[PDB]
């Protein structure tokens with residue numbers, strides 16, 4: 001469960017991301033594809049090379065979903081319900097892969113927001129991304 | 142999330158356990174200690190040998206908690222809140238270990254309830270134990 | 283992986299009673315039912331819409347037979363699982379890109395199927411020996427990732 | 429584990445800039461803060477009540493220094509991590525009984541600390557090289573379980 005301090009920390013850190021939201025999402029995907037090449041197979045219709053417009057566009061979608069989750073942090077199962085159906089049913093994304101993308105999102109935030117990425121905020125962000133991952137893996141059928 | 146069919150399957154399978162509830166819990170612990178010896182270190186004040194009265198007594202507690210979860214399956218965070226505090230705060234149980242005990246509970250049920258352990262019921266029981274594990278690991282601080 | 287002689291005995295004695303035409307398909311079918319994301323790798327197998335459809339699917343039973351054959355082969359070479367599973371590692375890691383967590387899951391599903399079939403004969407010490415085996419197999423199948 | 433020459437270059441060049449007195453303690457402290465169950469193994473270290481308490485704890489910084497030393501030693505022997513980590517494997521697996529998932533977690537926390545310290549210099553390809561390294565180290569530390 002996310003504590004009041006966790007929600008405050010996540011909102012504050014994500015607030016600093018700003019107009020870079022989409023960019024950071026795209027960078028996290030790139031980090032995931034390079035570090036954990038098994039994850040690439042979910043995107044055969046994507047060119048996954050650096051500067052790919054498809055990865056850039058997708059990073060914005062990922063960021064927008066995370067922003068939705070931050071904005072509705074006390075109601076995340078509802079806010080992410082459609083995305084949960086998509087990832088678990090249609091795409092059949094292996095639950096391990098959410099841990100991989102969550103790690104790459106943390107690395108991206110650490111690399112861009114050194115003042116915000118305190119040990120406490122790192123912990124809050126990890127709990128938040130784990131909560132998001134728990135919702136997105138909740139619909140396997 | 143547990144579906145209506147999942148809840149029906151879990152209630153039916155757990156209903157067959159009966160007065161063997163405590164016994165099966167004790168057997169699952171024994172299976173865990175022998176198969177995954179890292180888990181033994183949580184019980185230094187226990188004699189973990191076969192026929193141990195302490196493992197028998199503890200198996201009953203484990204079973205009673207699972208029975209509570211079955212009886213309050215739509216309200217499990219609330220029903221298991223005290224147990225979540227205990228396992229995450231006081232005992233600091235590594236989240237991996239819940240996957241290990243859940244597997245040993247499935248093996249125990251399979252070994253005792255061959256008619257009940259259909260593929261569908263196996264799936265429902267796995268989702269149920271994962272849901273229980275998610276609650277019991279929800280309070281790390 | 284190192285099994286005691288007592289564990290080797292327990293493992294080999296039980297394995298001799300295994301129905302080699304059925305147990306592999308039961309384990310693979312249950313993997314597909316219990317962990318539905320694994321169906322991603324088996325779109326060519328046809329009807330996987332219900333648990334009954336999965337378990338009765340002739341391709342699941344046939345493929346399951348191949349998987350079990352590989353476990354049998356591992357049991358014969360417990361001191362050289364890496365060599366035994368090298369080609370399978372290249373297939374599952376380099377070609378298929380299956381996350382290795384799923385190797386662990388299939389091994390644990392196999393353990394559940396053995397418990398189902400053998401009942402009280404699948405004692406806690408017999409299980410502990412089989413857990414060493416399926417962990418060994420999973421680690422060897424994952425070698426190309428290491 | 430096999431790194432390309434380009435990856436070896438990226439890894440060694442960055443590691444030469446690492447503050448070896450501080451980065452290990454930062455990684456170990458963050459492990460204790462982010463994954464609080466790991467505090468179970470460090471009751472003798474005293475005050476771990478708050479993140480500030482953890483990060484400022486002299487024993488955490490000192491022990492962190494030892495951990496980083498072991499990673500440095502691994503970087504020098506990428507083609508023999510098993511031998512390099514044998515005594516540490518016996519300690520962490522046979523004596524301490526730390527679940528090996530936590531070896532992976534500490535490696536990933538170290539990667540976050542490197543990203544924090546190096547910023548844009550910690551590029552996605554540099555990270556991918558370090559992920560190979562910390563996976564290699566985790567697998568070698570876990571050898572006594574295999």
Ligand code: HEM
Nearest residue numbers: 039042043061062065066083087091093097098101132136
């Ligand atoms: C923090 C976790 C994640 C978030 C917030 C997220 C968010 C999203 C969003 C917003 C979309 C687009 C939905 C739409 O257009 O209808 C999407 C699609 C998709 N996601 Fe994720 N995702 C996450 C994790 C993952 C992971 C771990 C994988 C696989 C490794 C994955 C694979 C995909 C794929 C394959 C698509 C469809 C792309 C396409 O066909 O165009 N996602 N995700």
Ligand code: HEM
Nearest residue numbers: 180183184202203206207224228232234238239242273277
């Ligand atoms: C299905 C998952 C689990 C359930 C339902 C469960 C249930 C329980 C219950 C009912 C108690 C007694 C509570 C009390 O007396 O106040 C307990 C205590 C305890 N549990 Fe669990 N538990 C689970 C998983 C685990 C795991 C995975 C571990 C460690 C590997 C663990 C370690 C302990 C310990 C060390 C105690 C305290 C024993 C003592 O000091 O007497 N539990 N658990």
Ligand code: HEM
Nearest residue numbers: 320323324348349352353374380384385388389419420423
């Ligand atoms: C201990 C774990 C496993 C063992 C021992 C095993 C064994 C095998 C064997 C013997 C084959 C036949 C290869 C051949 O025809 O020469 C095979 C093929 C295959 N396996 Fe597995 N497997 C394991 C886990 C998995 C998992 C977890 C998945 C996916 C979730 C998977 C996906 C596949 C697929 C898609 C094929 C067909 C490849 C092809 O025909 O090109 N395997 N496996």
Ligand code: HEM
Nearest residue numbers: 466469470494495498499520526530531534535565566569
């Ligand atoms: C890549 C992962 C790790 C590395 C490289 C590593 C390295 C080390 C090193 C170098 C020492 C000093 C041993 C000595 O004094 O000779 C040590 C001790 C210790 N480690 Fe780690 N470690 C890792 C992961 C972990 C984790 C995840 C935990 C617990 C969550 C842990 C718990 C301990 C403890 C309790 C000691 C003190 C043992 C003693 O003094 O008797 N280690 N480790």
